[PDB]
Amino acid sequence: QHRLDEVRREIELAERQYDLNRAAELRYGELPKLEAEVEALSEKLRGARFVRLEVTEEDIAEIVSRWTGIPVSKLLEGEREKLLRLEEELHKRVVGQDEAIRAVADAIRRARAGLKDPNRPIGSFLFLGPTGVGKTELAKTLAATLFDTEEAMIRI
Amino acid sequence: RNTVIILTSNLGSPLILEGLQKGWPYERIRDEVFKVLQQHFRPEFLNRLDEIVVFRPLTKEQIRQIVEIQLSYLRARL
Amino acid sequence: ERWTQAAREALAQAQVLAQRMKHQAIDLPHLWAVLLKDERSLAWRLLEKAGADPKALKELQERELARLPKVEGAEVGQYLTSRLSGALNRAEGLMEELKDRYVAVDTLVLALAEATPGLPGLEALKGALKELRGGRTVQTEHAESTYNALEQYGIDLTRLAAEGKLDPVIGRDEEIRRVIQILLRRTKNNPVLIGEPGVGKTAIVEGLAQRIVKGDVPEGLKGKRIVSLQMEFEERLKAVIQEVVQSQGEVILFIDELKPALARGELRLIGATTLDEYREIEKDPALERRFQPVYVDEPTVEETISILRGLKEKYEVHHGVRISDSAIIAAATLSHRYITERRLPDKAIDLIDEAAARLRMALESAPEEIDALERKKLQLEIEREALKKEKDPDSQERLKAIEAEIAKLTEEIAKLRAEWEREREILRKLREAQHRLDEVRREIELAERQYDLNRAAELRYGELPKLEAEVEALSEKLRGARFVRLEVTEEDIAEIVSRWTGIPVSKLLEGEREKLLRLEEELHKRVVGQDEAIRAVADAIRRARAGLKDPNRPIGSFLFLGPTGVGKTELAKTLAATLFDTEEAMIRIDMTEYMEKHAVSRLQLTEAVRRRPYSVILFDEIEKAHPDVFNILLQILDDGRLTDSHGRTVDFRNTVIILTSNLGSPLILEGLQKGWPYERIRDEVFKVLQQHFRPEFLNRLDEIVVFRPLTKEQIRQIVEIQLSYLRARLAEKRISLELTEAAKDFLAERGYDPVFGARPLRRVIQRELETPLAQKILAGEVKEGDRVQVDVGPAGLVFAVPA
Amino acid sequence: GIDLTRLAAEGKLDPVIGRDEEIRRVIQILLRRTKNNPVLIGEPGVGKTAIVEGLAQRIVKGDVPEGLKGKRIVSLQ
Amino acid sequence: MEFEERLKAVIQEVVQSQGEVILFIDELKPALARGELRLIGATTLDEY
Ligand SMILES: Nc1ncnc2c1ncn2[C@@H]1O[C@H](COP(=O)(O)OP(=O)(O)NP(=O)(O)O)[C@@H](O)[C@H]1O
Ligand SMILES: Nc1ncnc2c1ncn2[C@@H]1O[C@H](COP(=O)(O)OP(=O)(O)NP(=O)(O)O)[C@@H](O)[C@H]1O
Ligand SMILES: Nc1ncnc2c1ncn2[C@@H]1O[C@H](COP(=O)(O)OP(=O)(O)NP(=O)(O)O)[C@@H](O)[C@H]1O
Ligand SMILES: Nc1ncnc2c1ncn2[C@@H]1O[C@H](COP(=O)(O)OP(=O)(O)NP(=O)(O)O)[C@@H](O)[C@H]1O
Ligand SMILES: [Pt+2]
Ligand SMILES: [Pt+2]
Ligand SMILES: [Pt+2]
Ligand SMILES: [Pt+2]
Ligand SMILES: [Pt+2]
Ligand SMILES: [Pt+2]
Ligand SMILES: [Pt+2]
Ligand SMILES: [Pt+2]
Ligand SMILES: [Pt+2]
Ligand SMILES: [Pt+2]
Numbered sequence A: 001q002h003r004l005d006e007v008r009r010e011i012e013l014a015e016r017q018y019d020l021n022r023a024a025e026l027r028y029g030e031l032p033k034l035e036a037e038v039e040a041l042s043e044k045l046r047g048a049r050f051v052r053l054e055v056t057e058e059d060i061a062e063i064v065s066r067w068t069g070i071p072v073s074k075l076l077e078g079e080r081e082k083l084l085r086l087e088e089e090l091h092k093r094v095v096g097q098d099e100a101i102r103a104v105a106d107a108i109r110r111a112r113a114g115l116k117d118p119n120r121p122i123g124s125f126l127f128l129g130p131t132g133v134g135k136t137e138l139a140k141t142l143a144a145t146l147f148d149t150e151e152a153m154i155r156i
Numbered sequence B: 001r002n003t004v005i006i007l008t009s010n011l012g013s014p015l016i017l018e019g020l021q022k023g024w025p026y027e028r029i030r031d032e033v034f035k036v037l038q039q040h041f042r043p044e045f046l047n048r049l050d051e052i053v054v055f056r057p058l059t060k061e062q063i064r065q066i067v068e069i070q071l072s073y074l075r076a077r078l
Numbered sequence C: 001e002r003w004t005q006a007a008r009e010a011l012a013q014a015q016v017l018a019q020r021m022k023h024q025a026i027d028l029p030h031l032w033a034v035l036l037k038d039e040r041s042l043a044w045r046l047l048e049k050a051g052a053d054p055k056a057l058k059e060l061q062e063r064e065l066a067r068l069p070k071v072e073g074a075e076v077g078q079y080l081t082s083r084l085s086g087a088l089n090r091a092e093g094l095m096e097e098l099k100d101r102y103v104a105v106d107t108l109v110l111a112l113a114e115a116t117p118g119l120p121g122l123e124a125l126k127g128a129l130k131e132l133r134g135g136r137t138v139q140t141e142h143a144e145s146t147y148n149a150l151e152q153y154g155i156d157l158t159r160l161a162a163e164g165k166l167d168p169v170i171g172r173d174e175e176i177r178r179v180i181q182i183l184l185r186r187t188k189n190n191p192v193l194i195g196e197p198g199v200g201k202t203a204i205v206e207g208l209a210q211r212i213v214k215g216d217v218p219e220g221l222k223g224k225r226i227v228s229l230q231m232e233f234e235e236r237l238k239a240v241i242q243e244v245v246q247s248q249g250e251v252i253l254f255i256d257e258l259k260p261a262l263a264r265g266e267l268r269l270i271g272a273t274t275l276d277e278y279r280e281i282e283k284d285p286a287l288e289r290r291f292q293p294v295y296v297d298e299p300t301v302e303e304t305i306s307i308l309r310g311l312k313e314k315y316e317v318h319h320g321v322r323i324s325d326s327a328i329i330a331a332a333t334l335s336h337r338y339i340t341e342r343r344l345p346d347k348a349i350d351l352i353d354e355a356a357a358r359l360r361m362a363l364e365s366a367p368e369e370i371d372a373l374e375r376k377k378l379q380l381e382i383e384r385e386a387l388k389k390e391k392d393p394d395s396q397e398r399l400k401a402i403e404a405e406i407a408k409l410t411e412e413i414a415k416l417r418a419e420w421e422r423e424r425e426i427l428r429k430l431r432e433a434q435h436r437l438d439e440v441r442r443e444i445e446l447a448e449r450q451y452d453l454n455r456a457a458e459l460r461y462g463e464l465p466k467l468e469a470e471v472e473a474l475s476e477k478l479r480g481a482r483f484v485r486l487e488v489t490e491e492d493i494a495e496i497v498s499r500w501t502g503i504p505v506s507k508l509l510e511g512e513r514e515k516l517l518r519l520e521e522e523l524h525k526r527v528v529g530q531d532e533a534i535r536a537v538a539d540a541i542r543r544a545r546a547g548l549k550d551p552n553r554p555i556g557s558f559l560f561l562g563p564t565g566v567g568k569t570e571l572a573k574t575l576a577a578t579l580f581d582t583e584e585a586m587i588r589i590d591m592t593e594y595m596e597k598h599a600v601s602r603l604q605l606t607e608a609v610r611r612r613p614y615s616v617i618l619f620d621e622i623e624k625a626h627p628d629v630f631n632i633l634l635q636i637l638d639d640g641r642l643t644d645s646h647g648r649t650v651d652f653r654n655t656v657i658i659l660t661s662n663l664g665s666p667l668i669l670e671g672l673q674k675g676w677p678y679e680r681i682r683d684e685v686f687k688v689l690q691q692h693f694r695p696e697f698l699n700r701l702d703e704i705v706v707f708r709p710l711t712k713e714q715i716r717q718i719v720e721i722q723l724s725y726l727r728a729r730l731a732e733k734r735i736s737l738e739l740t741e742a743a744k745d746f747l748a749e750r751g752y753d754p755v756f757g758a759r760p761l762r763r764v765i766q767r768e769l770e771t772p773l774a775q776k777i778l779a780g781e782v783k784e785g786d787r788v789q790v791d792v793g794p795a796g797l798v799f800a801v802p803a
Numbered sequence D: 001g002i003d004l005t006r007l008a009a010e011g012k013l014d015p016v017i018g019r020d021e022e023i024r025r026v027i028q029i030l031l032r033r034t035k036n037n038p039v040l041i042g043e044p045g046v047g048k049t050a051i052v053e054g055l056a057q058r059i060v061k062g063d064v065p066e067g068l069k070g071k072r073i074v075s076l077q
Numbered sequence E: 001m002e003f004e005e006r007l008k009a010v011i012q013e014v015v016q017s018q019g020e021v022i023l024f025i026d027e028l029k030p031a032l033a034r035g036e037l038r039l040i041g042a043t044t045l046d047e048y
């Protein structure tokens, strides 16, 4: 990797002095091997009982979780997976009011997927009905389940 | 563009409840309730709403179900 | 003409002073009094730097003036004392002894310094004056002496106007004349220009400036000088104001945006500000002695067009391009019709100026393409270097494809780089021609101001002729040049305009004429059925333009009657879009809500209209409104204007007023069931109307359109046009959406409702089609480019990709 | 001051990517007689400096038009 | 912690160690902008 890097500065430095000479053997011959050498060793570690040269989502999600909350979601769930189980997740905290969940869920799904004007909120609703039977709860739960946190709520 | 806008109100509450006691068709309720709305909200508004969701009263069972989920935190904290 | 404007003005100053104090002989004390205004005054500087303290001089000099006789009428400022005249003529002898082509104010101080016993002699004085290192043999119309407060913080417009520096202001004779008039008033001589930003208030002032320099202005202003002040601060401000008063009204001050020198009746001022900003000024009885307001109204498109044509020259010269008249008209029209922010004069120009700017940014068109091939060349140029060293002699030496490319590129490069030089050069001369072609028009006008028609003829002949054609050949030489930073056209304008709105295809192309003729088509592209309504509305509008109706009324006023959700609001919306290139041109008034302090809550209406003259105004449930509103409304239908809270009326002549109501709906429906004659319905329904609406109202309505229920097929047609967007939306993902007639029929079915109309269709299409389709897209079942097939079946619609 | 055009020359600066407009815009303003001193206005972390050092790299590559072709950018600290 | 005379003598001596020596300032900037000198700090919030 260090060579390949040095070799990149190397080449570029030639495509300035016009010394096509050097720049030649570098871009063709040098860079080729080095690029295969590293890609060779990389692959040479596709299996490592004590190593992983790879940096992945989990790794990212983790350091991200370190600054926020639960990699279980930050990571794992992808918008797609999340939006499909949406009605489930919501019901884990909001009892009944099925009509509400579906509507909100469908609206949001209909929102992503790109079937609505991009210049609008993901979804807008008007909750009607009795008091203390779901409304604010659903609003809270939505914030959490959809945005991985009840901190994503803003009340007026 | 990345926000969800929820708006609450009790404008149709009474009528909605009434529609549930007299047990008349949901559609009859929604329409009856909408009219009321048309009296306190500019159509431009009601028309730009993705949905007009109607929450209803809870059933003894649900209430118990809520008790359960409510107990969860206690279980957890304990 | 003979002495510099500086000294020249100094003399006039002294003369006017003589008059003010009612003197007979314009003596030295007068000249001193005006020359020694501030510490900054040149006469003061030069004198203090020589030895004699100016203050004592001025002090003692005014003493003499105070010890002079009070004459009368024809004896005031009757003549020049022998001493003064002598000094004045001695000043000329001193200018020749210095090489100054004219008599400046400093050379004038020496002369007087000689005619005044007690202060420094030539030797000392010439040395001090000399302590300003040359530059006095310059021009006569401007010696450029930056010493005094006025010259320090003020621009002398009359000066620029003198040297043809000001832009040709055209089309505001009335406002200028009014300003002139006001300055002559004894009671209120300080005119303030009240107008909106961009209207051209300052233009008025500089326009007046030019007239003064041409003697186009009456007496009393004939020699005046207009100075524009431009925003310890007050320390210098006072130094300025107190210096204008010492000029003795011979200098008018112009503030683009105090009382002691004013109320005293010695500070002649010209203002300019907003309406409301001036209203506050109208709260100081001592000041608000009525600065003689002069409301400069925003020019019409035609006027704006003339103005643009005026500066046409300047712009294309100061920027080196060619602004076609076509583009000019566009800048005026398009702005006045779709630019809600600024007001005409300004915005139109900004458009022309801003559309051209892009041509300047369009200079880096060569390097980009030249270097684009350069790098691309080095790519293959270095690639060969590797194929030259062969391990495969008769397999690698077949790089004749790459080598050939280098040549071509070496060709294209040598081409464009040299070809570019043409454009660049052709421009070189052109810009020079436009400059001399200007220096000539300046020279000529000059002559035509001093009867030296000698030059005015030799130039206007042959000379001028050349440039005009030379700077005409050079332009014709830059046809479709690779670097066209010349012609500015409609497309260019329309584009920058579209950048602030939408679709040049219409903004541009579409001419009111073409648009008004296809009106019924366009409307039907979005509104299904209700043919009677479209026709009526369309004909009313067409009848409106063409000029067959009172100019003082809205373009068209209507009352939509009939069922609900069958066209009314849609037509209203569609109209706004099709007629005003945007649904943003709509303004709704949900009357069913304004049931309280209504009147007050709309002078809101006036504002929307105020910012968007061309717009459709929709009043829902008109019957629910209270008599109060009908007045504001009725006032719109008549005279097509309206007075808001503040006062400044808003223009409604360019609006379309649609009013809805369900007053006859039931009867209308009944008439359709019992299938009785349309005329029988209309008449029956009209009676009802006559019971809730004042005849004055019903009579001032261009049409009383009646919407009717939709037919099964109409719905389907709506379903189709409704699907259009979904499609145009799914298009962004190359996803096609073909539905079965069965499917469409299903939506039509579920979509329409007897009492609600086609309102439900949307919710239906959303749930029955969009919701499912969304799940498929997120789930991945529907990918990019797929052609989604939709058909009916049990439990609702079913989808199918390909298969 | 740190010579960015030099760090670019030696290939020390990291690859700025995806900001053609802004750069070109600056390239422009850096040639306008009236106002030739362009100021980058933006929130912290958006990549303002990148724009500059990005421009630096172009100069060293001749990727920049004429009039800046040989220029040297120095960052005062 | 002529003052800077010795300070520089220190900072320039840590860099010559080649990152093999970490400097710890309990409660400099220049030789930190260009890119060099591995440092570990510690302070109150406001300062930072
Ligand atoms: N459907 C539900 N599922 C779970 N908990 C519920 C539900 N409905 C109501 N609750 C409980 O009731 C309280 C408030 O519920 P919520 O739906 O936010 O009603 P509310 O209309 O916001 N009340 P308030 O803001 O006080 O006027 C919380 O303690 C909830 O746990
Ligand atoms: N009558 C006119 N003749 C020529 N140019 C004009 C005229 N009126 C306005 N303009 C142009 O419009 C711009 C502003 O003109 P100006 O007369 O200063 O108006 P304004 O209303 O005072 N602007 P503001 O000070 O922002 O409120 C300049 O670019 C002028 O060239
Ligand atoms: N003639 C029509 N052409 C096209 N779309 C129509 C038509 N009639 C009704 N619609 C549809 O119905 C909805 C509203 O139509 P509109 O004509 O504005 O009725 P309305 O006056 O608003 N009644 P409501 O919505 O019930 O208060 C929109 O979804 C329209 O697409
Ligand atoms: N266009 C880009 N290409 C590559 N890296 C970038 C780009 N823009 C920003 N960065 C990176 O983001 C970080 C900050 O970049 P910078 O250009 O300094 O932005 P900033 O918003 O100005 N912050 P600051 O200078 O500290 O006020 C550095 O790590 C950069 O490498
Ligand atoms: Pt393996
Ligand atoms: Pt919350
Ligand atoms: Pt007097
Ligand atoms: Pt004279
Ligand atoms: Pt001010
Ligand atoms: Pt530009
Ligand atoms: Pt551009
Ligand atoms: Pt609208
Ligand atoms: Pt009402
Ligand atoms: Pt109203």
Ligand SMILES: [Pt+2]
Residues within 6 Å of the ligand: E001
């Ligand atoms: Pt220290």
